[PDB]
Amino acid sequence: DNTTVFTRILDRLLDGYDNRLRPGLGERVTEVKTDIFVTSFGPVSDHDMEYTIDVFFRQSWKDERLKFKGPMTVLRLNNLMASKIWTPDTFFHNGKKSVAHNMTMPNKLLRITEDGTLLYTMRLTVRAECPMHLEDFPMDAHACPLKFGSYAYTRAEVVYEWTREPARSVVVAEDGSRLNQYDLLGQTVDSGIVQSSTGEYVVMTTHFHLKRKIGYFVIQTYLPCIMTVILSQVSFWLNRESVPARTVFGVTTVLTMTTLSISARNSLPKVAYATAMDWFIAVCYAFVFSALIEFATV
Amino acid sequence: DNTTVFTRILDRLLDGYDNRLRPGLGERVTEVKTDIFVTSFGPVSDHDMEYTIDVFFRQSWKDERLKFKGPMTVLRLNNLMASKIWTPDTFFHNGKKSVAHNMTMPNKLLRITEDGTLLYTMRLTVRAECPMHLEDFPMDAHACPLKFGSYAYTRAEVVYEWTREPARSVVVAEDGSRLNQYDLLGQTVDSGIVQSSTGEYVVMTTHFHLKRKIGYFVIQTYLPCIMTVILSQVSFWLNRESVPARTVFGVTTVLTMTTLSISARNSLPKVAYATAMDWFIAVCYAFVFSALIEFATV
Amino acid sequence: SNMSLVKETVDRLLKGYDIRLRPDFGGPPVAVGMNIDIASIDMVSEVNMDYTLTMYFQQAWRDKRLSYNVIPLNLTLDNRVADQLWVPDTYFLNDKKSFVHGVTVKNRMIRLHPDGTVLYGLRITTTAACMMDLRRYPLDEQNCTLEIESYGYTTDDIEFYWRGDDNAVTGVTKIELPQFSIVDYKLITKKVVFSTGSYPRLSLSFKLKRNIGYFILQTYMPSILITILSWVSFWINYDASAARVALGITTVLT
Amino acid sequence: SNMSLVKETVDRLLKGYDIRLRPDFGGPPVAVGMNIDIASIDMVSEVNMDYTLTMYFQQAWRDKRLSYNVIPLNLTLDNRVADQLWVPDTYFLNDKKSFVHGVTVKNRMIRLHPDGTVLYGLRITTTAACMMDLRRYPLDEQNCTLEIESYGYTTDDIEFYWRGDDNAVTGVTKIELPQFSIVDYKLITKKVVFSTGSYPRLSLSFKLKRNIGYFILQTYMPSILITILSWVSFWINYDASAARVALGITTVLT
Amino acid sequence: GDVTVILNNLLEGYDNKLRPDIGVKPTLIHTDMYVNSIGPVNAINMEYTIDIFFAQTWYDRRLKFNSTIKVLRLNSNMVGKIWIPDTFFRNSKKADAHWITTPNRMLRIWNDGRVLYTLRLTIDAECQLQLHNFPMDEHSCPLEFSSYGYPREEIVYQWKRSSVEVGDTRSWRLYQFSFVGLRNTTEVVKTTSGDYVVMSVYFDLSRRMGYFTIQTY
Amino acid sequence: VQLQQSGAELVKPGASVKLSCTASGFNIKDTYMYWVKQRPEQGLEWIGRIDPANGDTKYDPKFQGKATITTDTFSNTAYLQLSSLTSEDTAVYYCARKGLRWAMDYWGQGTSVTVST
Amino acid sequence: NIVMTQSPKSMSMSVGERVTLSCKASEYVGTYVSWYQQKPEQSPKLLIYGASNRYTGVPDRFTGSGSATDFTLTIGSVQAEDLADYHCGQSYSYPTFGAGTKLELK
Ligand SMILES: *[C@@H]1O[C@H](CO)[C@@H](O[C@@H]2O[C@H](CO)[C@@H](O[C@@H]3O[C@H](CO[C@H]4O[C@H](CO[C@H]5O[C@H](CO)[C@@H](O)[C@H](O)[C@@H]5O[C@H]5O[C@H](CO)[C@@H](O)[C@H](O)[C@@H]5O)[C@@H](O)[C@H](O[C@H]5O[C@H](CO)[C@@H](O)[C@H](O)[C@@H]5O)[C@@H]4O)[C@@H](O)[C@H](O[C@H]4O[C@H](CO)[C@@H](O)[C@H](O)[C@@H]4O[C@H]4O[C@H](CO)[C@@H](O)[C@H](O)[C@@H]4O[C@H]4O[C@H](CO)[C@@H](O)[C@H](O)[C@@H]4O)[C@@H]3O)[C@H](O)[C@H]2NC(C)=O)[C@H](O)[C@H]1NC(C)=O
Ligand SMILES: *[C@@H]1O[C@H](CO)[C@@H](O[C@@H]2O[C@H](CO)[C@@H](O[C@@H]3O[C@H](CO)[C@@H](O)[C@H](O)[C@@H]3O)[C@H](O)[C@H]2NC(C)=O)[C@H](O)[C@H]1NC(C)=O
Ligand SMILES: *[C@@H]1O[C@H](CO)[C@@H](O[C@@H]2O[C@H](CO)[C@@H](O[C@@H]3O[C@H](CO)[C@@H](O)[C@H](O)[C@@H]3O)[C@H](O)[C@H]2NC(C)=O)[C@H](O)[C@H]1NC(C)=O
Ligand SMILES: *[C@@H]1O[C@H](CO)[C@@H](O[C@@H]2O[C@H](CO)[C@@H](O[C@@H]3O[C@H](CO)[C@@H](O)[C@H](O)[C@@H]3O)[C@H](O)[C@H]2NC(C)=O)[C@H](O)[C@H]1NC(C)=O
Ligand SMILES: *[C@@H]1O[C@H](CO)[C@@H](O[C@@H]2O[C@H](CO)[C@@H](O)[C@H](O)[C@H]2NC(C)=O)[C@H](O)[C@H]1NC(C)=O
Ligand SMILES: Cc1ccc(-c2nc3ccc(C)cn3c2CC(=O)N(C)C)cc1
Ligand SMILES: Cc1ccc(-c2nc3ccc(C)cn3c2CC(=O)N(C)C)cc1
Ligand SMILES: Cc1ccc(-c2nc3ccc(C)cn3c2CC(=O)N(C)C)cc1
Ligand SMILES: *[C@@H]1O[C@H](CO)[C@@H](O)[C@H](O)[C@H]1NC(C)=O
Ligand SMILES: *[C@@H]1O[C@H](CO)[C@@H](O)[C@H](O)[C@H]1NC(C)=O
């Protein structure tokens, strides 16, 4: 007792409930209101060209079949109740490998309001592909997208919308930022349509604008390259008669420029095109090699 | 059918059976006889301070509820029967991560004797932590433990014991040794008590005694160091006029010494204290510098 | 006796038990006491900005639906009973990857008491994220935390507290790290507000001080003694240009 | 019809079927025939002392309870039926980690025959421990093996044999490895005794010979050269100390 | 609801262990494929990644229904209730479907019993690269698939003219390779358990020498 | 489907006025309710919005205090009340409903609120 | 506060031919720009919701487009019923409307 009334309410709700059918299957279109809270913007992987993001993924929709009358206006139920009812089959269009967290128990919540409205939040770590053009590397900025929508329900059946104003519908926790070599300038949301052979689907888009931090690349490539160039330069002040000295300087500097070139190329992915750092390295290499040619002519 | 009698026997055994309650839940103490057969002693990771071991973990106990009278004295049953009955929840206290193999089916064994004795064996790969002090590295020996006992059952409910004599209950296959740079000298077992926030528990301990093989470290770190010292010393016999030659001797000998110093440290984890190899490298390093100072002063 | 009695008691307890409803579903919040026994801080990586923590996570609460008086002793039941009972939906916000140890069986405990109290234990190893400020590296002190929170239940439904409030967390002094030392730790009880409500959060945090001993002989001594070697150029006769050139360039390469 | 009758017979076969008891529980051992089709040997590693092996692992045994005569065709059933049928508990003793492929569904086959035979296919990738003797590396030949035996059933309950005994393992010729060449392979049948009893063991072993061509140019050639240039010092007059000393000492460094 | 009644009738007396027309004729399955992306082609492991939307269409006499609803549009809840072909990729080192937020599976059933079943897959297909001519080598290596346990007498796969379509190709992960084009193929392969219709799609990839130029030349 | 907004109101300067927007054919709890004023022959300007299910209200930064949006879920009505009225408040006030892509799909007939003596 | 600049402020273009209304946004408003029609002495009527979507029961001569900040509304052929004031509003953030442009025939 003291909960038999609630047990009866829940048992009545599920009784004669078909969770294979979306709410309002024939009468109307199921309107799912979506919201994202980013508890942490994970590190960006350039080699894999992906970023990790940990979020509270909130979805809300109205289910007439779940209307109830009871002492409580909102039923805060366990996650396991969510499997017995219809929930949207949202998927991430550009998601590579996403994990639904389950410690200690599935990180999901289901809340039912007496009017039939449902709130369904889950905790996720989404790994989404973020295509990048690295022609300006390491002084480059990217808008990493997070597209999501419904699998198996077209615009005519399930549509997605932001719970609140689109500008305020994707919220990033102030302290949640696991970026090391990037800066999160802001996020932008959009809504559109995906044209598919199976139909037309609603896609909700979010773009996170990142600008790469250059301090590490400065310290590891540009300052060493400038220092190698100057080390090659100082040979001119050296004595002409010290031919072995100047030869050692030149050859060692050229070897040093090759090792910096090869070590700098491995950091970024094996893209075909040439990045800004590549041009800087090439020009520094040319300068040191010209110093060697000048010593040879002398 | 000849199988109908056994189906009836198994249905009578499991009728009105509670696998949530240990044998003798209120009257006596469930005494679990334990036995280990090491099919292979996996590699020992010094950097992670852990070792891998593959075993057949054997546990035996008596369950009066499972007494039967049939044409056979022992029921060799499919492992899925193990889930239908009560089994001890043994766990490894110092296990970092374990695998209960189930290819192609759960590698488990369940034999019920007519008098209610149970034999429950399983194939496991236990990755356990082996705290190890590396002061005498690479001339160091370790006693890597393997502690196991019950989860949630105190000594007043479940007590463990070795099946055979304690000196003969951990058996290692002669061909089953996956060690590369360690020598397995033997194993010792002990049984004790552990006090936790939840109660008092029986802990069964096995210690595997390991001796590190030095040959790799000989050929990789010592011979290079003695050779470097002698190569630095050869500079003594050279002419006092050959200043650049002896200078190059000194500088490149120190180059080799620094390379060997950095290359030796990664061969073992990041330990604050200094190992024997570090002392040897430091002494050879001091000798090389000594020789260099002799050349510089002369 | 003592076996059929226990079986019928447990059967009656689980009869008509609604796992979908928390203790006092329509009443006041259920209080859950958190008890932790740190087993090890397995590794602390600056590359991944996380650390691995193995622990015995214990939760205690009261479920009057699981109250019995016909048998006088604490009941320990097979861990699979935890699936038929209600357990708090505790989660660690800052965990990247975690699991419950499952050998030989799920390392989980269910202990019932006559008054209805439920002691629920788990052996959990979790990789938790903690951003590190490496400006003073390797002379830095890090502060990595584990944030324990309820997912679906607000402060109206559930409340968290440390059982003991000083002895709630044990085993910290025993932990040994190859390149770290635990300066101290703190247990914090607070509340966090999200768009969906206010939730109870507990935070266990450690102050880690890095051991400089390894880094000395790994990076500082080589650089120092390479500088010592570089100074040797002065003692050599300045006529031998090639010798001093080789010396200096070798030091730069080192 | 040919659908109602098939459904009827399949319903009859699984009605009152005791999965816990092997075929002929009290009688003679059940004979299981083994076929392997080596899809590939992905990677042989010296550091990890193992090799990955993808294969189609098929087992054939005869089960009286699964005999039907009202339909003259071989019934291939959706592999979910295997969860309701007895299958031998075969396992690979020397495997580290293995999985059955699960896309688009579990890569599993169950085929019944009117005489009672059951074909049980599985697609398995297995990382098997293969300890190596590197005395003659890279001039060495390894003997990686795969040890198949029954876990719960002794030789009084089960007997393994190769189905064909010569063409039981296929695809070894088609296998390709970047660094190894498969000299030959052998199929062995035997019985291994443990304290729990005696069990049937099958062994599949490959002879792998390292392709020296890579290593010659990769390692020996730089060595051969460096030790040749080291002889250039002889042709130079001993008067010029700097050149000879630099050449020898840099050869040593290389 | 009406759809609830229809679905209840369809599943009543339905054996998902038996394929349609089990004792009659081979089940003809039409397969399409949308190549969402061709992931990196790493030669060290001798494999390549590909993300696809696999679609399969067949006819199930047991799923015929008469009603004004012409197509039953369903989510993944029904995938495991009806019979599904056991298609697998023969040269896959490892593949997995997608499960966030729910199983990325769709199921549509028409009046005439036709079933359309699509799902999202990422496959680490293995193909041998003949690294002669590298880094000028050109490769064209497959993504084969077939039924695991059903020989050609029971399951037959068939392509469509517009079965295989590709994405934009600009967001693809190919860095050192360029996608020249694709071709499809069907054949019969002799196996220990019988003859199986093996369907193949070949992706022609041309290497880019630009990166290795900078790296080594 | 239709918002039966109140009638035109004549208000002396400095006197608060209550404007009601009655919704029919839908539950205001479902969507947001908006209030928009249009000056004579001028562009529209958003005043504020209310989320009746939650009760939250946001305002054009220039209307803090000068306006107050409230709802009556039981009455299925939205109210706008202006604290103080000046010569600048003699406009037409519209009630609108949040639409498909956050568009104001349904508008009320409007209320003429003239401030004069 | 996104400011939607709507131009031209007025039009007297001849009946029967093309009309182009261009609305520009100060900041990014992805596709949440809507077009409302306001006939004299009457409440506004929604014409375009989102960018390039028509509302139910709208003449097919109306069509819009726009991506980030440049949005336009096009009428294939004017009619006597199209003589009305048109306002562009954004809903990416708290709503703001444009100045509105009057359409006239002559
Ligand atoms: C050795 O031991 C191994 C370890 O046990 C063992 O591996 C395990 O094998 C089993 C069986 O093969 C696996 O169980 C299956 O899993 C399928 C999905 O697999 C993927 O996902 C799971 C994780 O599961 C979570 O997420 C999925 C995704 O949505 C959910 O479906 C689950 O509910 C679950 O969600 C919970 O967990 C979340 C987070 O953890 C929580 O947030 C959440 O709230 C939930 O609590 C992964 O483990 C899998 O990864 C592994 O497998 C891949 C294979 O390629 C490997 O590559 C990888 O490395 C991993 O090893 C994988 O990603 C399920 O679909 C499947 O369940 C269906 O089938 C069974 C059998 O018929 C049914 O009983 C079951 O009910 C399901 O059918 C229903 O659902 C389908 C839709 O999928 C419907 O189409 C169908 O009609 C039916 O609907 C009906 O029932 C519904 C009730 O469910 C009802 O709602 C409907 O209305 C309708 O009535 C099955 O559970 C298990 O995952 C493996 N685990 C691991 C670790 O490998 C291995 O096989 C053993 N080896 C041998 C040789 O024996
Ligand atoms: C995520 O965590 C949840 C919470 O535990 C897991 O749910 C558990 O799922 C297992 C596997 O299905 C359930 O065990 C099963 O029970 C049924 C009887 O109900 C039995 O037929 C099966 O053989 C199996 O034993 C378990 O009850 C369930 N626990 C609860 C309370 O939810 C879920 O599996 C996790 N997801 C994954 C796969 O990571
Ligand atoms: C590691 O980092 C955490 C996070 O900053 C530190 O926790 C902080 O601890 C202090 C003192 O224990 C908290 O301040 C206190 O707040 C209460 C609020 O009622 C106030 O009454 C006290 O007077 C005091 O100001 C602080 O809130 C807390 N941080 C957070 C985010 O909650 C922790 O001390 C650090 N060190 C260790 C060893 O954990
Ligand atoms: C790789 O290593 C395995 C294991 O050492 C080799 O298997 C061995 O094969 C020989 C020849 O078939 C077996 O000898 C046989 O012994 C039986 C014992 O009664 C005897 O009756 C036969 O006449 C024959 O002499 C040997 O037992 C077997 N080793 C084991 C442990 O079973 C294998 O040959 C090696 N090479 C390859 C390519 O697999
Ligand atoms: C993919 O497979 C389809 C079907 O096998 C091929 O379709 C044929 O296309 C040619 C045009 O070159 C037509 O002449 C044939 O009539 C088509 N066959 C059928 C049955 O329609 C298609 O060419 C294949 N695509 C490739 C190989 O790239
Ligand atoms: C053969 C085939 C073709 C297309 C699909 C398919 N089904 C969907 C459903 C939803 C969404 C968003 C995308 N879907 C796609 C793929 C697609 O069209 N893209 C990516 C543009 C499935 C099988
Ligand atoms: C943190 C750090 C420190 C030093 C380097 C460095 N590495 C090189 C290699 C070669 C040459 C010529 C100069 N190098 C320099 C010089 C430098 O960076 N300075 C002086 C600030 C890079 C990073
Ligand atoms: C497999 C291998 C190969 C070479 C070495 C090696 N590394 C050094 C470094 C320095 C010096 C002076 C000599 N080195 C030698 C060779 C050597 O010391 N021998 C022969 C006694 C070690 C292991
Ligand atoms: C159960 O355990 C608690 C705490 O360990 C103890 O106080 C209590 O006496 C125990 N109950 C019984 C019946 O022993
Ligand atoms: C059934 O399988 C057996 C296996 O050997 C084969 O010989 C026989 O021809 C098959 N029967 C039919 C009808 O295909």
SSE layout:
This is part of a larger assembly, with two copies of chain A (298 residues), two copies of chain C (254 residues), one copy of chain E (217 residues), one copy of chain F (117 residues) and one copy of chain G (106 residues).
Chain C (H helix, E strand, L loop, with lengths): L3 H11 L15 E16 L4 E13 L12 E3 L12 E3 L2 E6 L7 E5 L4 E13 L11 E10 L7 E5 L6 E2 L9 E15 L2 E14 L1 H24 L5 H13 L1
Helix pairs in contact in C: 2-3
Chain E lengths: L1 H10 L15 E12 L8 E13 L11 E4 L12 E3 L2 E6 L7 E6 L3 E13 L11 E5 L2 E3 L7 E4 L5 E3 L10 E15 L2 E14 L2 H7 L1
Parallel strand pairs in E: 1-10, 1-11
Antiparallel strand pairs in E: 1-2, 2-7, 3-6, 4-9, 5-7, 6-7, 8-13, 12-13
Chain G lengths: L3 E4 L2 E2 L7 E7 L7 E6 L6 E4 L13 E5 L3 E6 L9 E6 L5 E2 L3 E3 L3
Parallel strand pairs in G: 2-10
Antiparallel strand pairs in G: 1-3, 3-7, 4-5, 4-8, 6-7, 8-9, 8-10
PDB class: membrane protein/immune system
Keywords: GABAA receptor, Zolpidem, MEMBRANE PROTEIN-IMMUNE SYSTEM complex
Entry title: Human GABAA receptor alpha1-beta2-gamma2 subtype in complex with GABA plus Zolpidem
Describe the model.
This is part of a larger assembly, with two copies of chain A (298 residues), two copies of chain C (254 residues), one copy of chain E (217 residues), one copy of chain F (117 residues) and one copy of chain G (106 residues). Chain A has 298 residues and is an alpha+beta fold. In chain A, 26% of the residues lie in helices and 34% in strands. Chain E is elongated. With 217 residues, chain E is mainly β. In chain E, 8% of the residues lie in helices and 47% in strands. Chain G has 106 residues and is mainly beta. Chain G has a single domain, classed as Immunoglobulins (Immunoglobulin-like, Sandwich). Helices cover 0% and strands 42% of the residues of chain G. Chain G is built from no helices and ten strands. In chain G, β6 and β7 form a beta hairpin. Chain G is globular, with a radius of gyration of 13 Å. Chains B and C meet through β4, β5, β7, α4 and α5 of B and α1, β1, β2, β6 and β7 of C. The complex binds a molecule of 10 linked components (NAG-NAG-BMA-MAN-MAN-MAN-MAN-MAN-...), a molecule of 3 linked components (NAG-NAG-BMA) (3 copies), a molecule of 2 linked components (NAG-NAG), Zolpidem (3 copies) and 2-acetamido-2-deoxy-beta-D-glucopyranose (2 copies).
**Shape, principal axes of CA atoms of chain E:** elongated
Strand content of chain G: 35-45%
Number of strands of chain G: 10
Give the N-to-C terminal Cα separation of chain G: 37 Å
Measured between the Cα atoms of the first and last residue of chain E, the distance is: 70 Å
Glycosylation sites (chain E): 66, 184
Family (chain E): Belongs to the ligand-gated ion channel (TC 1.A.9) family. Gamma-aminobutyric acid receptor (TC 1.A.9.5) subfamily. GABRG2 sub-subfamily.
Subcellular location (chain E): Postsynaptic cell membrane; Cell membrane; Cell projection, Dendrite; Cytoplasmic vesicle membrane
Extracellular side (chain E): 1-212
